[PDB]
Input
Amino acid sequence: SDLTVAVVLPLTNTSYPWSWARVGPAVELALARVKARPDLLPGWTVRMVLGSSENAAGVCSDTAAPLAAVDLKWEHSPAVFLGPGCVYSAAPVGRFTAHWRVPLLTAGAPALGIGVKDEYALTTRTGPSHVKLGDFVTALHRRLGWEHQALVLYADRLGDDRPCFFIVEGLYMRVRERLNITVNHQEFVEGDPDHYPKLLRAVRRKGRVIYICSSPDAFRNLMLLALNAGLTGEDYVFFHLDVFGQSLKSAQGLVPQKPWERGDGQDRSARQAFQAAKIITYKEPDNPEYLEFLKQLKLLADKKFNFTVEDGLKNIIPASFHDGLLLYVQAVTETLAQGGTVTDGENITQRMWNRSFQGVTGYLKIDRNGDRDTDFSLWDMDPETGAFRVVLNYNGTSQELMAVSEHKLYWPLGYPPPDVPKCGFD
Amino acid sequence: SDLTVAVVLPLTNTSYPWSWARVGPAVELALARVKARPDLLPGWTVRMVLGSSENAAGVCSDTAAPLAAVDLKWEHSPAVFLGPGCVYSAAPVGRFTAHWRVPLLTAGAPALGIGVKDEYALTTRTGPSHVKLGDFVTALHRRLGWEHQALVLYADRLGDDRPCFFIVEGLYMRVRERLNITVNHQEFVEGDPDHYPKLLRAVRRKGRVIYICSSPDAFRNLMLLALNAGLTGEDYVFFHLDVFGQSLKSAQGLVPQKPWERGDGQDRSARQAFQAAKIITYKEPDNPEYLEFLKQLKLLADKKFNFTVEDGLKNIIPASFHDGLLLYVQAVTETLAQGGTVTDGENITQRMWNRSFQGVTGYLKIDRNGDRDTDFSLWDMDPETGAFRVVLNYNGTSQELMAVSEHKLYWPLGYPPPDVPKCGFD
Amino acid sequence: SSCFGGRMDRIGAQSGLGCNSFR
Ligand SMILES: *[C@@H]1O[C@H](CO)[C@@H](O[C@@H]2O[C@H](CO)[C@@H](O[C@H]3O[C@H](CO)[C@@H](O)[C@H](O[C@H]4O[C@H](CO)[C@@H](O)[C@H](O)[C@@H]4O)[C@@H]3O)[C@H](O)[C@H]2NC(C)=O)[C@H](O)[C@H]1NC(C)=O
Ligand SMILES: *[C@@H]1O[C@H](CO)[C@@H](O[C@@H]2O[C@H](CO)[C@@H](O[C@H]3O[C@H](CO)[C@@H](O)[C@H](O[C@H]4O[C@H](CO)[C@@H](O)[C@H](O)[C@@H]4O)[C@@H]3O)[C@H](O)[C@H]2NC(C)=O)[C@H](O)[C@H]1NC(C)=O
Ligand SMILES: *[C@@H]1O[C@H](CO)[C@@H](O[C@@H]2O[C@H](CO)[C@@H](O[C@H]3O[C@H](CO)[C@@H](O)[C@H](O)[C@@H]3O)[C@H](O)[C@H]2NC(C)=O)[C@H](O)[C@H]1NC(C)=O
Ligand SMILES: *[C@@H]1O[C@H](CO)[C@@H](O[C@@H]2O[C@H](CO)[C@@H](O[C@H]3O[C@H](CO)[C@@H](O)[C@H](O)[C@@H]3O)[C@H](O)[C@H]2NC(C)=O)[C@H](O)[C@H]1NC(C)=O
Ligand SMILES: [Cl-]
Ligand SMILES: [Cl-]
Output
């Protein structure tokens, strides 16, 4: 007569895209629509029981989260788990829920190994995955003739969820799986100056198509050092893997978009350097339903959660929890319509998998593997104004690259420079 | 009035050094001696509740084990956990017990990361640690002039506990922490022939002091390929990191010791190749108490466990669980003698740490970090007979290398070859 | 380190990527 939904997310820390101050009102919006829909679980009263994935210091934990999962499992015996979003939180919990035969929904956990559903059984991802980034890079390289060698630089803060490692892992593994070109890689520490000589040296020795996963300031500094060192768009192209677009403002206002502007009197040199820089991000959903969702999300989050949800790419994560929760309820409704129960995790999961759905994020497709296809945008600067704008869009499902607003990809030489230099790298 | 000891180990699989078929009777012997000792917990009746760390396939699991720990924690509220020994089993359980403020004892879990007692609080290791292997290697390099470069090759079976990775990790980190020499490393897959050209190439390009962590057969094949390629003891020295001495028989009988002998008509070529090979192992405890312990262990394990405990270096693990459990009981006895309780994990743990103890393994020392100092042996072949024998012993506590039975370290050139070649590696 | 010291979960050992591996 009622559905018990267990939630394991950061219930107090509001810094994550999957924080409860941000996913809570999104999910409450979802349940509120379930009530208004006579075609989704009629008569059922879906309840939620919460558990925090963060430890005493307030960061998501590889211990707090699995402990909270067990706690909710024996106290309430839920039918489904929601979250966690952190990789190190979701890995033990996913293995627990897989062993319990309970479905798991999260718009986080994008890491490669979560994709091994033979292990993370009944885990459905409704947000971005890092192999899907590999899919975008693959399509990019096929469309620009880069079929030999690319360099990947990534950095992480000690003690975090290693976001840039998992991003690069997914890109590296998928791109090599599909193109079998040489993908060199190098980890660095952002705060460590000793690595910047090393990195610049590697940049001009290991690759000319260069992907960097780092903070905005690290990517700006590297560009400034690359210009200072005579590394221009005629030979090098630097892709910043900024999937949440931290180096940009939101797509609602703040016209125009300048990631090289900093106010430190280096902005004139940074713009000239950023002519060789392009920014890869997740795609902002275009559909109006998304904008109405943000309006309601901001209103609810400020109302029953004392939080101020700001505009930006991170909001696709609570939008995807909202869409994933609606995706699940219909699956459960369909399972009940054929004599099943809410505990047939296999039947319910298979109903969600390999399926197209319409949500606030627009068209979303769950692939045969249970992971949402992810759309990406490619930002480039206008050589006239210097501001960055989307010039290329990747549909994750059809794996097609489409030009945006009749824009062209800026190249100092008119065409992309080769991924291999003249007479080798020497 | 009674002490509850929770156990998370492989209760069915008897393949691990820390299997219950082998640690069970050792622990049984320990509790049996606690009864006989009026000075160890008088009146208390120590009980044991068991949980299996293996999953449905019968291998130790990163999921079964933490689940069993939770299960025992709420069902019985134990005062101490015993095990697990697998690294991926111990890490989540260790973090759980550290969050529960419950002491943890294991003679396994030798991985570097377990050494972070700021995370793995109240975890006391009474068996070997892989940083201690670095200590041995450091002392070795200091005593033979190798202070520049060494190469490390390691391989693992896909899906196991990655033993050779954690071995090498501990050696890598510790040796580099103390000597700051270049330690090159390369992973390979044993069953993959494509790596043997690569490895042989790396051997003669990346180092001359070479450590290999692999199976016996892989190390033999590598030696055979090294001889076939003209790599002799005059320039190269190959250390096999065979800590449990899988490539050797037991030290009780089976005289003599020939790891190159295989019976495949290649034994004549393998002996000549193994002239450049030395084997690093744990040290067999010399004390008579150890021999009497094995006799009783074999008897009990065949009696109440239907298992046949065979002679070999692996038996130091159940001996260390036995010694570790006795070390605990005295600590609890001393805590009770000063008004504490059995739940003062911090007081009990500190009483065990930085402490010298006498057990069946002889002198054992728990360092300031809660880890048992580990003694190592160095085997070398006699150029007359070809059989291998211990020629060097490392006391983990004093960090001294002592010659064994007046033997000398065999060198084709009379002295060890330099860790750097003549005019560079080119 | 680029390869060693990074946690003890099988999720961080799906590719290496800091390590020198042939697999
Ligand atoms: C990224 O690529 C995806 C794959 O190419 C796109 O998916 C396609 O999405 C469209 C709709 O957005 C979908 O179209 C049809 O889907 C229904 C199932 O086949 C079909 O019944 C619909 O038809 C009905 O409605 C139309 C009016 O809309 C009527 O004219 C018809 O007579 C009928 O009543 C609808 O036409 C495709 O099937 C779907 N393709 C795949 C392979 O799933 C994504 O939309 C695209 N995303 C973006 C943002 O571009
Ligand atoms: C690896 O190195 C370790 C450090 O060098 C060695 O540890 C040493 O072990 C010995 C005993 O094995 C220990 O000796 C004394 O320990 C007691 C504490 O100091 C001390 O009270 C003892 O003295 C008593 O007994 C003797 C007879 O045995 C009498 O003559 C005395 O009058 C007294 O009544 C005992 O002498 C060292 O203290 C200890 N050193 C350290 C730094 O801990 C390990 O033994 C060694 N292992 C191996 C296998 O070689
Ligand atoms: C909410 O989460 C934030 C990110 O998850 C967190 O920010 C970060 O805080 C940690 C402290 O836990 C910083 O890191 C340190 O971690 C260990 C534990 O003290 C230290 O040993 C390390 O040396 C390191 O100093 C991160 O650097 C920091 N990162 C950022 C971007 O701020 C917030 O603190 C959390 N806030 C609350 C209220 O819980
Ligand atoms: C007792 O433990 C032994 C070692 O922990 C175990 O040996 C190993 O068994 C596994 C099977 O679980 C083999 O590996 C395979 O693992 C996965 C799961 O099927 C596969 O996808 C892999 O491709 C791989 O084939 C190991 O190779 C094997 N190792 C050895 C040295 O034998 C025993 O099977 C366990 N026995 C019992 C009765 O539980
Ligand atoms: Cl989380
Ligand atoms: Cl174990």
Q: What stands out?
A: The interface with chain B takes residues 62-64, 66-67, 70, 92, 95-96, 98-99 of chain A (CB under 8 Å). Chain A has two domains: 1-127+285-372, 128-284+373-426. Residues B 356, 362-363, 395, 397-398 surround ligand 2 (CB under 6 Å). Chain A has eleven helices and 15 strands.
